[PDB]
Structures are given as C-alpha cells and as structure tokens.
Design an enzyme around this catalytic site. Structure first.
Site, PDB file in Angstrom:
ATOM      1  N   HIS B  41     -24.122  12.695   4.073  1.00 34.12           N
ATOM      2  CA  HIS B  41     -23.667  13.653   3.026  1.00 34.12           C
ATOM      3  C   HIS B  41     -24.769  13.670   1.823  1.00 34.12           C
ATOM      4  CE1 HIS B  41     -21.457  10.241   1.012  1.00 34.12           C
ATOM      5  NE2 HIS B  41     -22.138  10.618  -0.014  1.00 34.12           N
ATOM      6  N   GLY B 143     -23.799   6.904  -7.091  1.00 34.28           N
ATOM      7  CA  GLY B 143     -24.884   6.643  -6.665  1.00 34.28           C
ATOM      8  C   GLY B 143     -24.930   5.489  -5.928  1.00 34.28           C
ATOM      9  N   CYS B 145     -23.264   5.098  -3.000  1.00 34.63           N
ATOM     10  CA  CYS B 145     -23.219   5.460  -1.570  1.00 34.63           C
ATOM     11  C   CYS B 145     -24.584   5.061  -0.619  1.00 34.63           C
ATOM     12  CB  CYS B 145     -23.225   7.038  -1.333  1.00 34.63           C
ATOM     13  SG  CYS B 145     -21.564   7.536  -1.930  1.00 34.63           S
TER      14      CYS B 145
HETATM   15  C1  LIG Z   1     -21.660   8.017  -3.807  1.00 37.64           C
HETATM   16  O1  LIG Z   1     -22.636   7.363  -4.461  1.00 37.64           O
HETATM   17  C2  LIG Z   1     -20.627   8.861  -4.261  1.00 37.64           C
HETATM   18  C3  LIG Z   1     -19.958   8.438  -5.634  1.00 37.64           C
HETATM   19  N1  LIG Z   1     -18.926   9.389  -6.149  1.00 37.64           N
HETATM   20  C4  LIG Z   1     -18.422   9.459  -7.511  1.00 37.64           C
HETATM   21  C5  LIG Z   1     -18.722  10.793  -8.110  1.00 37.64           C
HETATM   22  O2  LIG Z   1     -18.930  11.755  -7.659  1.00 37.64           O
HETATM   23  O3  LIG Z   1     -18.252  10.719  -9.366  1.00 37.64           O
HETATM   24  C6  LIG Z   1     -19.343   9.971 -10.284  1.00 37.64           C
HETATM   25  C7  LIG Z   1     -18.972  10.317 -11.749  1.00 37.64           C
HETATM   26  C8  LIG Z   1     -19.778   9.446 -12.556  1.00 37.64           C
HETATM   27  C9  LIG Z   1     -19.279   9.519 -14.079  1.00 37.64           C
HETATM   28  C10 LIG Z   1     -18.643  10.390 -14.453  1.00 37.64           C
HETATM   29  F1  LIG Z   1     -18.326  10.631 -15.731  1.00 37.64           F
HETATM   30  C11 LIG Z   1     -17.902  11.412 -13.391  1.00 37.64           C
HETATM   31  C12 LIG Z   1     -17.980  11.189 -12.181  1.00 37.64           C
HETATM   32  F2  LIG Z   1     -17.625  11.853 -11.391  1.00 37.64           F
HETATM   33  C13 LIG Z   1     -17.256   8.839  -7.625  1.00 37.64           C
HETATM   34  C14 LIG Z   1     -17.052   7.829  -6.508  1.00 37.64           C
HETATM   35  C15 LIG Z   1     -16.028   9.932  -7.307  1.00 37.64           C
HETATM   36  S1  LIG Z   1     -17.040   8.248  -9.124  1.00 37.64           S
HETATM   37  O4  LIG Z   1     -17.793   6.920  -9.150  1.00 37.64           O
HETATM   38  O5  LIG Z   1     -15.656   7.601  -9.273  1.00 37.64           O
HETATM   39  N2  LIG Z   1     -20.081   9.717  -3.374  1.00 37.64           N
HETATM   40  C16 LIG Z   1     -18.668   9.678  -2.954  1.00 37.64           C
HETATM   41  O6  LIG Z   1     -17.842   8.806  -3.344  1.00 37.64           O
HETATM   42  C17 LIG Z   1     -18.304  10.526  -1.986  1.00 37.64           C
HETATM   43  O7  LIG Z   1     -19.188  11.600  -2.061  1.00 37.64           O
HETATM   44  C18 LIG Z   1     -19.205  12.620  -1.047  1.00 37.64           C
HETATM   45  C19 LIG Z   1     -20.395  13.600  -0.947  1.00 37.64           C
HETATM   46  C20 LIG Z   1     -20.416  14.378   0.064  1.00 37.64           C
HETATM   47  C21 LIG Z   1     -19.395  14.640   1.051  1.00 37.64           C
HETATM   48  C22 LIG Z   1     -18.095  13.705   0.814  1.00 37.64           C
HETATM   49  C23 LIG Z   1     -18.222  12.685  -0.160  1.00 37.64           C
END
Ligand SMILES: *C(=O)/C(=C/N[C@@H](C(=O)OCc1ccc(F)cc1F)C(C)(C)S(=O)O)NC(=O)COc1ccccc1
Ligand SMILES: *C(=O)/C(=C/N[C@@H](C(=O)OCc1ccc(F)cc1F)C(C)(C)S(=O)O)NC(=O)COc1ccccc1
EC number: 3.4.19.12
Lengths: 305, 305
Positions: B41, B143, B145
C-alpha cells in the site's frame, strides 16, 4: 494509535555488554572505549558479602584475575580501579561498537530501558521507573548484576543505572555509572529496607492524557480542583505532591487535548476516591505511573533514533 | 526474581530498517540480503486505498519511483515484485548487517517483539501477542507501517509480522513476511470487523505459574478440576478452550512449582468466578495473557542471544 510500555531500541547497548568473572563470580560489564564498568561485588565470595572490605579485597586482585570476555573473545585487562561501588577495568582494546554516550544520574520518577543480560549476553529489554524510594521493580535473576539502564537521545546513549542487588523484599537497587547507589543502599548482604514507595502523580496524569489521546475518556468528570486541594487527596493515597513544575511539564499534553491540568487532577482525585468501578484505562485496572510526560509526548509523536 | 513484559534485544532488527517512499507515501521497509520488504500500500494515494487494484497501480511504478534510504544513504532499486500484500524491492547492495533470519508464520496466542519505526528509524520495542482473532494491540502512529514483529533464537531472527493497518476499532492487522495477512484482513480502507477476542488461557496459566515462582501465591486454592469442567467455565468467560497439548506445554512450570496444571486451572476457575477482590498478581489487577509458557520459562531461566 495504541499506547504500550515501550523500551528504547537496545542495539547500541547490546554492543557494549561483556562477561566479567573474578574467580567463580560471573556477572555483566559495560565496555565503553577502553574501560569495562561492573559492580565491585564481582570480587566477593559468599561470606565476603556479609561485611566486605572492598579496599582490602581489591588489593589481592591483579589485572589477570579479572576475566573479561566479549562474545567468544577475551579482553586483556591492563589496569583496574574502584570508583564508589563500580570497578573500572582498563583493557588494551577500545570497544569498536562504542556509541556516543553520557553518564547521567536520573531523578526519581524518570523512566529508562533495562537490557537484562546473563554471562554478557542480552536476554531482553524492558522500560521501568526510578521509584521515589530509589528502588526499581525489574526482572533480575542470578547473573543479571552489571545489566544497565539507559535512555537514548537521537544517537547518544545516556547510561543512568547499573544493577547491583535484589533486596530481601524482591525490589532492585543499583548505581549510576559513577558507582553511586540510588537511594540509601549499600553493596552488602545486610538488612536494607526501602522507604515508602509513593505513586508518581505527574506520570499518572501523563498516562491519563495518553488515555484521552487514544480514545479512553470515561473518567473525564465535570469537576476541577486546586493544587492544594488535589495534594490533600494525593497525600491520603500515597501520591507524590504535584508542583507547579509538574503542571508546566504537562502543558504540551494539556494543549494537545484541550484538558486543563487541574481538570485532569479533578479526574484523578475522583478515581482515587471512587476507584475504577470495574472499568479499565488503556487496558489497565490500575493507575499506571511508569510513563513520564516526555514518554507520552515521545510515543504519541513518533520520535526516532 | 521479578517478572516484566520483556522484548527481545532489537539490535539485529534495527540494522535492517529502511525508509521506503513511493511519491509522498513514506513508510518502513525491512532490508535483508539484497531485498527490501514493505507493505504494497506504499504505492496507494488517499483515494486508491478505498478499492485499490494493486496489479494495475504497480504497472505504473518503475524501480526509480521507489525511494529506499538506509540512514542517510540511498539504495539503488534494480527490480520490484509483488508477493501477496508485500513488495520485494531488489536493491544492488546486500545489507551488510543482515542477521541469520527465517520468515515464520506464527499461531494465535504466540508472542513476539515489535520494533516500532518511523521514516526507517527505530522509536521503541515492545512485546505483544497474536490475538486469537488475528489482530494485535500495538502502538502504531502514521508512518509505522512496515514495522516488523520478530522472535530471536540464539543468533537467528524469526520475522513473523509486518504492520499494515489500523482497523477503525484501533487494533492492528498485518502480514507475515510472505505478505499473507494474519486473519481475514485486506489492505483496503474498508469496513473490516475483528472476530471475538478470546483470552489465551494457556498464557494466563503460564503467568499464574510465573506469579507463584516470584512469590505471589494468594490465589492458590484447595480445589482441583478436570479439563471438561474447567472448559465449561472458560467458555462462559471468553477463554480459549484448554487442550491436553496446552497441559503438556505447561509441564515444565508444573514440575518447577509442584502445582498440578489442573490445580492451577481450579485456581483460574475461582479467579474467573469470584474476581481478584481488589487484590493483584505480579502487580496487575487483571489476568495477563501475553506471556507464553515459553516466555515464562525463558524469563525465569535467563536464556540469552
Ligand atoms: C501506516 O503507517 C498507516 C497508519 N495510518 C494512520 C493514518 O493514516 O492516520 C494518521 C494520522 C495522524 C495524525 C492525525 F492528526 C490524523 C491522522 F489520520 C492511522 C493508523 C489511521 S492513525 O495513526 O490512527 N497506515 C494504515 O494504518 C493503513 O493504511 C492503508 C493504506 C493504504 C491501504 C490500506 C491501508
Ligand atoms: C546479581 O547477579 C545478583 C543476583 N543474586 C541472586 C542470588 O544470589 O540468588 C540466585 C539464585 C538462583 C537460583 C536459586 F535457586 C537460588 C538463588 F539464590 C538473587 C537476586 C538473590 S535471586 O535471583 O533472587 N546479586 C545480587 O542480587 C546481590 O549480590 C551481592 C553480591 C555481593 C555483595 C552484595 C550483593
């Protein structure tokens, strides 16, 4: 999201661990530049430990009596000296894996990572706190002495702890890397009592902020308090008194969450008076105090090394 | 003595972490020999993640679109392929820090260490468990992942997990290093529900043995039970059924402590039916299930790497 008891990466410290043997006593040493640091009680027998005269015991030791082994490879000891409760064994080879390092004496309430070792080999890493009574609650078996506690800032390892002894109550005592014990403890097999183990209030508040950031907010009440009112309750419950310095340290978490420090204090006051009522916070049924405000900011912001 | 949630030393894995960027998506990769493994991804945008066609997205990527950086130093990508949900980026340089390693697919209930990273830099290490519903309860920010889970046997790193995604319920899903998700999860931004998270009974029993070994025995009752009677109570409380295989695995702890596995089951049965009554075990007010019998034996015996 998610909030875990997290240790610093241990690689930089793994590269510094050696085995030190002084006739039939084996424990761990820390090899930095051309010096190996270890607990001076490596030179004691069974019976010596009851009332050791370290000055006198050390006079009967020569360089060649200190067996220092780094993995499979023997180090040549070309000098030895005693600084407080540690030995400095001067070896003919600088540790090629010496990281940038400081020796730091930490304050009660501060956390650090321990690399538990046996026979100079790392077994595991865990995060713990200097208790207000200058003990730590570690995981230390026979042969773990000389295992170290540390923090990392980017690329610099701050060594703050070396493990010396388990008290009869099963808590742990040791020194800074200048060989000065944390708290009143001495490296002798004797009656040594820890003082009262108070709860690190500022750390509990930091962890309640971590809880809110990670979505667990059921304990947020409609109340506020004052430092003086809160501290009346802290004292009752064996919590450390909260100072304006602690309030200031919580500022960035207060800013991130929009929850005033004294409002969080009012939440903590209610939790102390009423308990959890069978509820949990960040998957725990007790108020966690081994995260500093800096730990919560670090984990919640993703700081690296 | 003392019993801590303990991670493996992380040094061997630290030396394998790199940053992978595919236009404006940055996450972590694992550099072993001349291959960098990362979540596929990395190639997705914002909108791609809702229903990505990875085959089609990958065709528009060239080797030079995959920015791989090991500390300050850029790696030359000379090939890329997709295996299930991971990318294999073939680089022109073998990682000089490649440890002895296996790829292993672990079973639910087994524990492993996670080296949480950001931008290819290690932030921290923590021990967790593959839940029976094939989620983990980690600490993963944006970040993280590509961060990996692993076990060490002496000098060999068994990589078992790579982090891919946080579910909307804030639990974590990922793959083995062949890119096959644990459990039913897919690398898409979609409605994905975890199954029921049962308690890992064999691990709770292991931890009750750890408690007895470390002096906390108040919960030892005067009762015994049978597997079938115990399992009636396990089922009521969302515990995994205990098998004869689990009983056999607990044998060495049963031998060390002199407490028959079914007697410990009778202790656990009473704890489930009556609760702790405001008491603690190894400093916890809840029944811990993220220590395997092997973890308890390892920690209590002082195994090294
Ligand atoms: C991997 O590194 C990753 C983490 N995703 C984050 C995200 O996107 O949110 C970060 C975020 C940080 C600060 C903010 F104010 C708002 C935010 F959304 C989360 C885990 C959702 S967050 O830390 O809770 N990626 C994933 O978890 C999944 O990503 C994908 C990407 C492509 C396809 C499927 C899944
Ligand atoms: C440091 O490595 C160390 C550990 N001491 C052990 C100990 O001696 O007991 C080990 C033991 C293992 C298995 C047994 F069946 C019985 C045993 F006693 C303990 C921490 C007491 S044990 O793991 O609980 N040394 C110390 O803690 C302090 O040692 C000294 C030595 C000299 C002077 C003062 C203190």
């Amino acid at each position: 999201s998610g909030f875990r008891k997290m240790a610093f990466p241990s690689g930089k410290v793994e590269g510094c661990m050696v085995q030190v043997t002084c006739g039939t006593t084996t424990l761990n040493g820390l090899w930095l530049d051309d010096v190996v640091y270890c607990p001076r009680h490596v030179i004691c027998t069974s019976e010596d430990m009851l009332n050791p005269n370290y000055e006198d015991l050390l006079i009967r030791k020569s360089n060649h009596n200190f067996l220092v082994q780094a993995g499979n490879v023997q180090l040549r000891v070309i000098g030895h000296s005693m600084q407080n409760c540690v030995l400095k064994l001067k070896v003919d080879t600088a540790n090629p894996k010496t990281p940038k390092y400081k020796f730091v004496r930490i304050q009660p309430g501060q956390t650090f990572s321990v690399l538990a070792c046996y026979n100079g080999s790392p077994s595991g890493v865990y995060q713990c706190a200097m208790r207000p009574n200058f003990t730590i609650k570690g995981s230390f078996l026979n042969g773990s002495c000389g295992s170290v506690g540390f923090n990392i800032d980017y690329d610099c390892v701050s060594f703050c702890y070396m493990h010396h002894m388990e008290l009869p109550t099963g808590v742990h005592a040791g020194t800074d890397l200048e060989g000065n014990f944390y708290g009143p403890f001495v490296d002798r097999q004797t009656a040594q009592a820890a003082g009262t183990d108070t709860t690190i209030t500022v750390n509990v508040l930091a962890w309640l902020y971590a809880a809110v950031i990670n979505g667990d907010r059921w304990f947020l009440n409609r109340f506020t308090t004052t430092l003086n009112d809160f501290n009346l309750v802290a004292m009752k419950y064996n919590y450390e008194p909260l100072t304006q310095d602690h309030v200031d340290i919580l500022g960035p978490l207060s800013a991130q969450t929009g929850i005033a420090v004294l409002d969080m204090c009012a939440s903590l006051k209610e939790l102390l008076q009423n308990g959890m009522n069978g509820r949990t916070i960040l998957g725990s049924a007790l108020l966690e105090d081994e995260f500093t405000p800096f730990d919560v900011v670090r984990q919640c912001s993703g700081v690296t090394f």
